[PDB]
Every structure is written in C-alpha cells, then in structure tokens.
Amino acid sequence: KIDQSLSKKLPKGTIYDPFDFSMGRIHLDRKYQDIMKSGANPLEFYARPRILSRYVTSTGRIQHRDITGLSAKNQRRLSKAIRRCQAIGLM
Amino acid sequence: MLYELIGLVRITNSNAPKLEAKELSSTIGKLIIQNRGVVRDIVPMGIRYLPKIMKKDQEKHFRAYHFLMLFDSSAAVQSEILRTLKKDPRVIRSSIVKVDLDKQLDRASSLHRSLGKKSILELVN
Amino acid sequence: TPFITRIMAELKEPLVLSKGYNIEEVDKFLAAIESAKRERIEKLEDRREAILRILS
RNA sequence: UAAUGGUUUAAAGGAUCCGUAGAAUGAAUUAUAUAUAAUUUAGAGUUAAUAAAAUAUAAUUAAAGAAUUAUAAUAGUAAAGAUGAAAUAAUAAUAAUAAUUAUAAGACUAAUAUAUGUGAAAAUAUUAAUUAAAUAUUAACUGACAUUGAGGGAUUAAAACUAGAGUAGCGAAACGGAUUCGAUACCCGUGUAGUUCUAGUAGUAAACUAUGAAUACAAUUAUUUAUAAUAUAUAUAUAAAUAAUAAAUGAAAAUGAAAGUAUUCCACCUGAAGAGUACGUUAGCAAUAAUGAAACUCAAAACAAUAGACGGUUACAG
Ligand SMILES: [Mg+2]
Ligand SMILES: [Mg+2]
Ligand SMILES: [Mg+2]
Ligand SMILES: [Mg+2]
Ligand SMILES: [Mg+2]
Ligand SMILES: [Mg+2]
Ligand SMILES: [Mg+2]
Ligand SMILES: [Mg+2]
Ligand SMILES: [Mg+2]
Ligand SMILES: [Mg+2]
Ligand SMILES: [Mg+2]
Ligand SMILES: [Mg+2]
Ligand SMILES: [Mg+2]
Ligand SMILES: [Mg+2]
Ligand SMILES: [Mg+2]
Ligand SMILES: [Mg+2]
Ligand SMILES: [Mg+2]
Ligand SMILES: [Mg+2]
Ligand SMILES: [Mg+2]
C-alpha cells in the first residue's frame, strides 16, 4: 500500500481530467483546502456552552476573527456571549 | 421588564437531585407573583458538571442542577430577587439578564430563541 | 408649578399602562376577543391580570 | 526700505467642550422705502414610527476569574534565591526552597483585540442590573430659531497635597551588597511615601493629529463599515471611515477631501539668549497654577532637504 496523502480519490459521479492523476492535483488540493455564520445572534447562546465552546481553544481562549471568519458584529457578540457564559458559572 | 434568571442550584440529596431546584423555583416564583410580577417560563436545564470545583460560601461543589426562569418584574423586585439568590446557600451561581421588549411584548428564553423559536407563541404551536 | 406636578401625578396613577396602551381600550379589546371567540371565567381573569402586570 | 504675513515640523491652535456680549457673521420669494411686512423650507431644531446588539459611554449597585503574597499543615532533604558573575546587617537544620492541600487579604482584568468603536477632551474593552446620553431612514411639525465665541462656566492623565480607611504586589527616599580609578548611577536585597477606596484641593502633560470650529465646493481607485433594495447573484446603489493618489498647495518633508479652492468667527506668533525667569497680583492647605517684564550680550538662531563621515547599526554574499 501507499500513503493516502500521496494518492488521490476521485469521487463518484464527477468528471475528471488526466491532470487529476498527478502530484500536481494533490498539491493543489492541499493549498486550497457555521451556526454563527448566519443570521443567528450569538448573544442568544450565552447559556449554551456546547455551541460556543467550538469557537474557543482547548484552554478556552476566544479565537481571533481571522480564525472564526465571522463578521465584526458577530465576532463582538460571540465574544460577549462567551465572556457572559464564563461569568455565570458555565464554560 | 422581562428578565431571564439562570440559577445553578446545589444538589446534596443524591437520591432526589431535583428536590432543591423545585423549592428554589417555588420561592423565587412566589416572590415574583406576590410582588405584582409574572412568571413566563421555568425551563429546566439538567444536572451538569460545573467547569471547576466552585466554592459557594464554605462548601465546594462539582456539579449542579441548572435551571432557567423567565419572568416579568419591576427593577426593584428584580434586585430583591438577585439579593435573595446571592445570600442563599442552596444557590451556587446566579445571573439575571434583561430581555428587551421594545420590539415584541412576547419573547422566548435565550435557549428557545437560540433554537429558532423567537416567541412563546411559536413554542406553543 | 402646577403643570409638572399634574403630569408626574398622572404618570403615577394606578392602572397606568406603558407602550401607549390604555386600560379602557385594553379591557374592551379583551372582552371583544372573548365575544368573537364565542361567536365562532377565572382563567380569563388570570390572563387579564397577567396582561395588566406585563403592561403596567 | 515686506505682512499684496503666518501658526504640522522654522516663533505661533487655547486640554476640551458649553455658552454670554460681539459696536461679529449668517437661508429663500414678493412688496414698500440696509430695514420693515407678508410669505417659503434647502440650514437648525421637536415629536412619533420603523430598523438595528443603538452592545461600546457616564454614574451607581451587585458579581466572576487567573495569579501573587503571607499563614498553617502533609511528606520529603540540603541547599535556596539572585546575577554578566557575585554578594547582601534581616533565606534555610528553629527543616528551608520545590511540591499538594486549606485559610486570609488586597490589587488587577488573559483570549476576543482592531481602541474596531464609544466619549467634548481627559478617558474607556472580565460579568450583570438601574438610570442618563448617543444611530439611520421615513412621517408630521416649527419657520433661520443658525455659526462662532472675548469675558465666564464645566470637566480634565500622571505626579502632588488634606482627612479617614486599606496596603497583596510594585516602588521615589533611605539603609545595605555589587560594579568602578572613583559610584554620588545603571544591577541586587530590605523597603517608607505613593500606587487602592471614600470626601475634597489643585487645573497642569509630547493634555499630540505637535493640525481650533463651522459652511460650500473639487478628479479617481481599492477596501471595509452601515443602510436601502433587487433576484449566493446584481463584481448591486447611497453614506461614513480607512489606504494609495490626480489636481492644488507647499521651504520641502508632505497634505489630499485638508496642509486644496473659498467664506465666517475665535485663539496665538513676530531673532537667539536673559525667561516662562524676576517683581507684583489673583487663587490654592501647601507643592504650586495663572498672568508675565525689562536691562545686559550677540549676529546669530532654527526648519526641510542634499552628499558624505560615523554608529558598542541591520541583512546578504563572498
Ligand atoms: Mg507696507
Ligand atoms: Mg523643536
Ligand atoms: Mg513650533
Ligand atoms: Mg487640540
Ligand atoms: Mg500646545
Ligand atoms: Mg483583554
Ligand atoms: Mg459655541
Ligand atoms: Mg492612562
Ligand atoms: Mg493621588
Ligand atoms: Mg491619607
Ligand atoms: Mg502599600
Ligand atoms: Mg522590589
Ligand atoms: Mg552614567
Ligand atoms: Mg533599588
Ligand atoms: Mg475640581
Ligand atoms: Mg507647570
Ligand atoms: Mg500648557
Ligand atoms: Mg505651511
Ligand atoms: Mg509660575
């Protein structure tokens, strides 16, 4: 067998080109690799530690907007919700 | 004003953990209704492990019965309720947050509003 | 001054409702809802009292 | 014999805003002699509705969190701590340091984060509540009610002072240990005042964008940011901010929607030094703050840029 990284699995029902059978395709795939990214207000999840534990680190540090990819407003609301959750004995 | 209380009641009686939370809710609700208030919801959260070993007064806890209460009351009685909560050994953590009614008279709790049910009318349909 | 005092007193009267509601209109509206429902008692009193408490 | 000036950096924007006088300035149409009168809504306002987290700001009250220090124990043993390396009158055999618990006290606020924003500025980002303020667009309404603003008023970092609390950490002064030719310094150790809170006084900062406020206008692009649509797509329109610019300006650096084109009102400047000094006055418990000279001396003094030299300056090569 060979390492799965070095191989490319062409999905089912998809068209392909001969290029797809090449290291170029895998390399191009590597280089070019939710609830809050929506109309939902993150400040309504302040009592739901499971949901907003996805937007923190293993130690609990809120993730930068560069990571979360949220809008500025939803980043601010999410940070407020996480801090409030930390204060009220959850989180 | 509509307020949302989220209490973390202690559970010392292992065989019936909900016993404390029921009488907490009864006391707070009696206070609210006898002070020209209204109680809209008493949504129970379950028994959950606290993130840390939280020490209310001089006893350490590792888990608690979480519960939510949505109630309409005035500012003075809301402060009184918070006062009673803070000086109660049964309660480990407490928090009261306003739910703004400038748009809608009817509004669901934070949990139901997060699920998608914006108001109690949706939640009863 | 009479004006300021009368305005504040009228604000402090009982059965004064916020959000532009009037107690007479509210009572008539609730009775109209019930009569319309018939045309298509303590529980209704509790509903009325809850409404007046929320709108107080 | 130069104001046919200036104030980001050469001298010069008031810390900020509010607002009185102004013998300051200021919309539209018509009529009659710059005014009066009647009309108008484009500036400036008021009240609703709608949307949005008006979340952020201010005061108040109520909470949370990591850590630090000390105290007590538990076991365990000879070093620990600090430094460039060491040493310290008060580290450890009186069992220390490290570890694990348990109590106590103060102060602070990790991530998010950009101070994005909010606030007149100073400031302001752990949580919640009360009160107060702040957004856009529509509807209706007032009919110039505006701008600026001498004097005045209010607020105003850090330090400082007066009382009363508090004082864990940090830490002026002081006392010691080093280093040094010397140490009065940088470094190390104890550490008072202060830093914290309450009630005040004081009103200064490179209180800075070193850039006063308002109004009208001027070529682009790209980003966001916030609304309004239209069916993720219109690389969607309308605003603000940010970034790079055209023109213009400018001693240039550069500014760039203002340091451009204009208008209005206020503040300020007039060589260096003497000097923000002296004297006086006012205020303040004081420290001080404000106001603020002159003689004497000189042909200096400063700003931007240019080319070098130098650097206990960077990177790359050989
Ligand atoms: Mg002349
Ligand atoms: Mg200079
Ligand atoms: Mg200057
Ligand atoms: Mg200024
Ligand atoms: Mg100045
Ligand atoms: Mg932070
Ligand atoms: Mg003014
Ligand atoms: Mg500061
Ligand atoms: Mg002080
Ligand atoms: Mg004192
Ligand atoms: Mg101290
Ligand atoms: Mg020290
Ligand atoms: Mg020296
Ligand atoms: Mg020292
Ligand atoms: Mg004062
Ligand atoms: Mg001074
Ligand atoms: Mg000054
Ligand atoms: Mg100039
Ligand atoms: Mg002086």
DSSP line for C1-53? -HHHHHHHHHHTSTT--STT--HHHHHHHHHHHHHHHHH--HHHHHHHHHHHH
Question: Which of C29, C54, C55 is the best substitution to test chain B (most B C-beta atoms within 10 A)?
Answer: C54
Contact B63, B94 (CB under 8 A): no
Residue type, B76: A
Domains of chain B in start order, with CATH, are 2-124 (3.30.70.60)
Per CB-CB distance under 8 Å, the chain B contacts of C50 are 38
Q: Measure A62 CA to ligand 7 centroid, in angstroms.
A: 45
Contact C54 B72 (CB under 8 A): yes
Buried b (16+ CB within 10 A) or exposed e, B10-41: bbeeeeebbebbeebbeebbebbbeeebbbbb
Cβ–Cβ contact A10 with B under 8 A: no
Buried b (16+ CB within 10 A) or exposed e, A49-84: bebbeebbeeeeebbeeeebebeeebbebbbebbeb
Per CB-CB distance under 8 Å, the chain C contacts of B38 are 50, 53-54
Encoding tokens for residue A7? 């191989």
- φ/ψ region of C53 (left if φ > 0, alpha if ψ in -120 to 50, else beta) reads alpha
- Residue recorded with tokens 């019965």: B65
Beta bridge partners of C56: none
Contact B110 A44 (CB under 8 A): yes
Resolution in A: 2.6
State how far the alpha carbon of A49 is from the alpha carbons of A52, A83, B60, B103, C47, in Å: 6, 11, 22, 27, 35
Experimental technique:
cryo-EM
Q: What is the dihedral of CA B96, B97, B99, B100, to 10 degrees?
A: 130
Question: Which of B110, B113, B118, B119 is the best substitution to test chain A (most A C-beta atoms within 10 A)?
Answer: B110
Strand D, nucleotides < 7 Å from a protein CB: these are 49, 51-55, 61-66, 102-103, 110-114, 116, 126-131, 224-226
Q: What angle do CA B108, A80, A83 make, to 5 degrees?
A: 105
Cβ pairs bridging B and C (under 8 Å): 11
